[PDB]
Amino acid sequence: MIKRGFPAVLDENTEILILGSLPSDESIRKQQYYGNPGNDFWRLVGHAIGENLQDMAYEKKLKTLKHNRIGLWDVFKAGSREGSQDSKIGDEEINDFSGLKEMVPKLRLICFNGRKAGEYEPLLRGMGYETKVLPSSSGANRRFSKNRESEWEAVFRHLEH
Which residues are named in the active-site annotation? Predict the structure, then answer.
């Protein structure tokens, strides 16, 4: 099957909009990023905002993000990530970001989770918004990127002062 993204997890007050690349099918079966707990995102952001997202139920950890002025979304609305040789995102169905100025006027930093997301960084540098290519929060990168989560802390600590 084609991997389908999620509707924007957004508040009218959002300083940082985090665009992943293409949500994992394990996420999509639950229809939740937390659907696979290997997304360490909740600890990476959680230590930075000082509020443990991990132990909160999915609805509440999102409420906490809206509180800290964080929104969640993706780049690829639909992409083919299937069992093949290359296993590359073929399908080119991508979200509109010309509307970012309407949906997020408080937006200052667009955090791209994973390389595939961060390839579309120079696109959103045209929207007058600062852009940061964060690495993938998934377990695949987690096992290697231990001290790299310190840059995540530098991002979300500002959300108070």
Answer: 39
Question: Which two three-digit tokens encode residue 98?
Answer: 């010309």
Reported in sequence order, the residue ranges of the chain that DSSP labels E, i.e. its strands, are 3-4, 16-20, 70-74, 76-79, 93-94, 109-113, 130-134
The domain tally of the chain equals: 1
CATH of the domain at 82: 3.40.470.10
Asked if 100 contacts 124 with a C-beta cutoff of 8 angstroms, the reply is yes
Residues with a known catalytic role: 39
- Method used to solve the structure: NMR
Domain of 157, in residue numbers = 1-161
Torsion of CA 141, 112, 83, 5, to 10 degrees: 130
> Cα separation of 61 and 143, whole Å?
23
Pairing relation of β-strands 109-113 and 70-74? unpaired
What DSSP designation does 144 have?
T
